[PDB]
C-alpha cells in the first residue's frame, strides 16, 4: 500500500518518507575518534532521508579502534556530536546513532559482560545528550548473537547477549528510541534457526524498528536457490521493518507494495546523492560514488557531491 514518499510512524517519531539512509562508516572523525565540523555539513546535506542511521559509533575507549571513526563514550564526543544533530534537526530530519561493539565468532570474557552492558547504557544516554533521536544496536553472527564468550546451545542463550543489551538500552532511553539492525549474511561483505527467533524476541521488546540487511535480488548466476529470510522476519516482527542491500527505486517500491517492508534504507546511493529522495521523485540520474574516497579523511568524496 504505502509509497516510498509517504510518512511513517515509528517509535516516538514520524519520518517524512520511507527512503532512509543506511549506516556508513566514512572516517571523517579525528584520529582519537572525536566528531568534526565537516560531519555536520555531511549529515545535514542528507537530512531529506526519512531517517538517517549514523555511521558506526564506538561505545568503549579501547575496543574501536578504527581511527577516524567516532565514538560516544566521552563528554568531549557528546559535545562534538551536538553540531551534527543540530544541523540535521535544523534541516527538519531525524538521526539515530548506530552503536558499535566489535565481536568475535566461535574476544570477550563472561566477566566483562557487565562492563559491556554499562558501556551501552552510557553510550545510549550520551546519544540523547548529544541530541540524537535514538540509537541502533548492530547484531550479526559475530556480534551479540553467537558471540565468542550460558551464551550457547538453546536459541534463547544464543540471542541472550542481544536481548540483555537491548533491554538495558530500552531501560535507559525507552523502546521508542531503540532500534536494531540484523546482518544475517555478514557485516563487512544456521541463519533461519537463529535470526527468526532474534527478531521475535525484539518484536516482543517492541523496539522502534528493525533494520535487516538482505539482498533485494532473487536469481543470481552460479548460486543455488535459498528462500529469502525477510518474509519470515515479517511474520514474527510486528513493528516497522526496514530492508536494506542493493535496492533501487523500483525494487524498493516493490518491497513496500508486497507488504514485506515498511521502509527501505540505502547506503551507497546516499554517498553520491545527498538528495536521493528528490532524485527518486523526479526520476533524475544518480551521481556515481567514488569508492576511493569512502574512507579518506577530507571533504573530497564527502561533502562535495552536488544536490540537484
Ligand atoms: C562505505 C560504507 C560504509 C558502511 N558502514 C557501515 C556501518 O558503519 N555500519 C553498518 O552496519 N553497515 C555499514 N555499511 C553497510 C551499509 O549500511 C549497507 O548495509 C550496504 O552498503 C548495502 O546497502 P546499499 O546497497 O544500499 O549500499 C557500510 C557500507 C559502505 C559501502
Ligand atoms: Cl505510519
Ligand atoms: Cl573539527
Ligand atoms: Cl567500541
Ligand atoms: Cl568523559
Ligand atoms: Cl519509549
Ligand atoms: Cl552506488
Backbone breaks in the chain (C–N > 2.5 Å) follow which residues? 106, 149, 189
Annotated binding site: 23, 25, 56, 98, 181, 244, 246, 267-268
User: Measured from the CB, is residue 268 less than 6 Å from ligand 1?
Assistant: yes
Nearest CA residue ID for atom 4, ligand 1: 24
- Distance, in Å, from the CA atom of 224 to the CA atom of 202, rounded to the nearest integer, reads 30
Calculate ∠ Cα 58-61-64, nearest 5°. 45
Nearest of 138, 45, 134, 118 to residue 87 by alpha carbon? 45
Nearest CA residue ID for atom 28, ligand 1: 24
- Distance, in Å, from the CA atom of 166 to the CA atom of 205, rounded to the nearest integer, reads 8
- The full set of domains in the chain, from first to last, is 1-308 (3.20.20.70)
User: Could you say which DSSP state residue 143 is in?
Assistant: B
Calculate ∠ Cα 206-199-190, nearest 5°. 165
Do the Cβ atoms of 77 and 64 come closer than 8 Å? no
Complete DSSP assignment for 170-185: HHHH-GGGEEEEEETT
Q: 178-194: b or e for each residue (b if 16 or more CB lie within 10 Å)?
A: bbbbbbbbebeeeeeeb
What is the number of other CB atoms lying within 10 angstroms of the CB of residue 17?
Answer: 21
User: Measured from the CB, is residue 96 less than 6 Å from ligand 1?
Assistant: no
- Distance, in Å, from the CA atom of 3 to the CA atom of 9, rounded to the nearest integer, reads 14
CA 187 to centroid of ligand 2, rounded, Å: 29
Residues 6 or more apart in contact with residue 90 via CB below 8 angstroms? 44
CA 93 to centroid of ligand 4, rounded, Å: 26
- For residue 8, give the ligand nearest its CA: 2
Cα distances (Å, whole numbers) of residue 265 to 46, 51, 146: 13, 9, 26
Do the Cβ atoms of 308 and 275 come closer than 8 Å? yes
Q: How buried is 57 (Cβ within 10 angstroms: 0-12 exposed, 13-18 middle, 19+ buried)?
A: buried
Which residue is associated with the grid cell 574512507? 295
Report helix, strand or coil for 294: coil
Ligand 7 ion: residues within 5 Å (CB): 268
Q: What is the resolution of this structure in A?
A: 1.8
Do the Cβ atoms of 194 and 145 come closer than 8 Å? yes
Q: How buried is 150 (Cβ within 10 angstroms: 0-12 exposed, 13-18 middle, 19+ buried)?
A: exposed
CA 145 to centroid of ligand 2, rounded, Å: 30
- Distance, in Å, from the CA atom of 67 to the CA atom of 221, rounded to the nearest integer, reads 38
Handedness of CA 124, 28, 242, 199 (dihedral sign): negative
User: Could you say which DSSP state residue 241 is in?
Assistant: E
CA 180 to centroid of ligand 7, rounded, Å: 24
User: Among 143, 151, 247, 305, which one carries the catalytic annotation?
Assistant: 143
Three cell numbers written together for 10: 515509528
User: Measured from the CB, is residue 294 less than 6 Å from ligand 1?
Assistant: yes
Nearest CA residue ID for atom 12, ligand 1: 23
120 is catalytic: no
Do the Cβ atoms of 145 and 157 come closer than 8 Å? no
User: Could you say which DSSP state residue 83 is in?
Assistant: H
Do the Cβ atoms of 63 and 102 come closer than 8 Å? yes
- Helix or strand (DSSP H, E) at 100: strand 95-100
Amino acid at each position: 500500500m504505502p509509497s516510498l514518499f509517504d510518512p511513517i510512524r515509528f517509535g516516538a517519531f514520524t519520518a517524512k518518507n520511507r527512503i532512509w539512509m543506511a549506516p556508513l562508516t566514512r572516517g571523517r572523525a579525528t584520529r582519537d575518534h572525536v566528531p568534526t565540523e565537516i560531519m555536520a555539513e555531511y549529515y545535514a546535506q542528507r537530512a531529506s532521508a526519512g531517517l538517517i542511521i549514523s555511521e558506526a559509533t564506538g561505545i568503549s575507549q579501547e575496543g574501536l579502534g578504527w581511527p577516524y571513526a567516532p565514538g560516544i563514550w566521552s563528554d568531549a564526543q557528546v559535545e562534538a556530536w551536538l553540531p551534527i544533530t543540530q544541523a540535521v534537526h535544523d534541516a527538519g530530519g531525524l538521526i539515530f546513532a548506530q552503536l558499535w561493539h566489535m565481536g568475535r565468532m566461535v574476544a570477550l570474557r563472561l566477566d566483562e559482560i557487565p562492563r559491556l552492558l554499562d558501556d551501552y547504557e552510557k553510550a545510549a544516554r550520551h546519544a540523547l545528550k548529544a541530541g540524537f533521536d535514538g540509537v541502533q544496536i548492530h547484531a550479526a553472527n559475530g556480534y551479540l548473537i553467537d558471540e565468542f564468550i550460558e551464551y550457547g546451545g538453546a536459541v534463547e542463550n544464543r540471542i541472550r547477549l542481544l536481548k540483555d543489551v537491548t533491554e538495558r538500552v530500552i531501560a535507559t532511553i525507552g523502546k521508542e528510541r531503540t532500534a536494531v539492525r540484523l546482518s544475517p549474511y555478514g557485516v563487512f561483505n544456521g541463519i533461519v534457526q537463529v535470526f527468526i527467533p532474534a527478531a521475535k524476541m525484539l518484536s516482543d521488546l517492541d523496539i522502534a524498528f528493525l533494520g535487516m540487511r538482505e539482498g533485494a535480488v532473487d536469481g543470481t548466476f552460479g548460486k543455488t536457490d535459498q528462500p529469502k529470510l525477510s518474509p519470515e522476519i515479517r511474520k514474527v516482527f510486528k513493528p516497522p521493518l526496514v530492508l536494506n542491500q542493493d535496492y533501487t527505486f523500483e525494487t524498493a517500491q516493490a518491497a513496500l507494495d508486497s507488504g514485506v517492508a515498511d521502509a527501505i534504507s540505502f547506503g551507497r546511493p546516499f554517498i553520491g546523492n545527498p538528495d536521493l529522495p528528490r532524485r527518486f521523485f523526479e526520476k533524475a540520474p544518480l551521481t556515481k560514488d567514488v569508492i576511493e574516497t569512502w574512507y579518506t579523511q577530507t571533504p573530497k568524496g564527502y561533502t562535495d557531491y552536488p544536490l540537484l
